[PDB]
């Protein structure tokens, strides 16, 4: 089982740091955690998504690979992966005790709350993903690398540098698999199971964008950065 080469240890350092610097209340999200009590539950939800989107943008900008792409590609990739990454970041903070996910590193929500907030079935998918990820014990590095894989999706429509984005994805997937080899998780077939979690996150991304098209509720009720990334 090959382990990370020197240059992959370097890329792992870079992508882990980008994640840790833009991940809300890193490793102090549970003690600093409040709970919440209809286009009013949606209201409470839309006033808090803007900083979650802002952090994803911030994460991408700390990837030199991302910064080398032309702005029109950068916009398209962020539109594609933004809800996938906020969803992963929320799912890795599933608390089995309270049965909550954590948004913006301080707000605990239940399945029912997120659903009433307008996510519909996507709420059930994010919670099932969180429950199945408790036994995966993903560290900052594995989360950062999943995020980089989702960001560098060559298949988003209207991209100019399809080939280059594909090569970045391949570099991240190889380093990630090598790191996974090194970490020797106590879960059979770990890497195949992780590729299936990527697929789950991509379905969350495509269902999220689908649901947005269906919730024309006046658009002005929704924050601008949230109607841009759909």
């Amino acid at each position: 089982k090959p382990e990370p080469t020197d240059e992959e240890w370097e890329l792992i350092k870079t992508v882990t740091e980008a994640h840790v610097a833009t991940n809300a209340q890193g490793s102090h999200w549970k003690q600093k955690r409040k709970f919440l009590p209809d286009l009013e539950a949606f209201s409470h939800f839309t006033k808090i998504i803007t900083p979650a989107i802002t952090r994803v943008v911030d994460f991408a900008k700390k990837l030199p690979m991302f910064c080398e792409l032309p702005c029109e590609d950068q916009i398209i990739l962020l539109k594609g992966c933004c809800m996938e990454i906020m969803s992963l970041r929320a799912a890795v903070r599933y608390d089995p005790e309270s049965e909550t996910l954590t948004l913006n590193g301080e707000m605990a929500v239940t399945r029912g709350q997120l659903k009433n907030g307008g996510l519909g079935v996507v709420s059930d998918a994010i919670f099932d993903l969180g429950m199945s990820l408790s036994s995966f014990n993903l560290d900052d590095t594995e989360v950062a690398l999943l995020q980089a894989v989702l960001l560098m999706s060559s298949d988003r429509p209207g991209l100019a540098c399809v080939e280059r984005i594909e090569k970045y994805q391949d570099s991240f997937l190889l380093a990630f698999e090598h790191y996974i080899n090194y970490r020797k998780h106590h879960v059979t077939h770990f890497w195949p199971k992780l590729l299936m979690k990527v697929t789950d996150l991509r379905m969350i991304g495509a269902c999220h964008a689908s649901r947005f098209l269906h919730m024309k509720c006046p658009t002005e009720l929704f924050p601008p950065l949230f109607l841009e990334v759909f």
């Binding site: 802002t54 943008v57 900008k61 950068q74 916009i75 962020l78 539109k79 601008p224 950065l225 841009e228």
Partner: peptide, 11 residues
């Protein structure tokens, strides 16, 4: 369109 994304992206 994507006027705010473009703002946050350039810096």
């Amino acid at each position: 369109e994507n006027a705010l994304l473009r703002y946050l992206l350039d810096k």
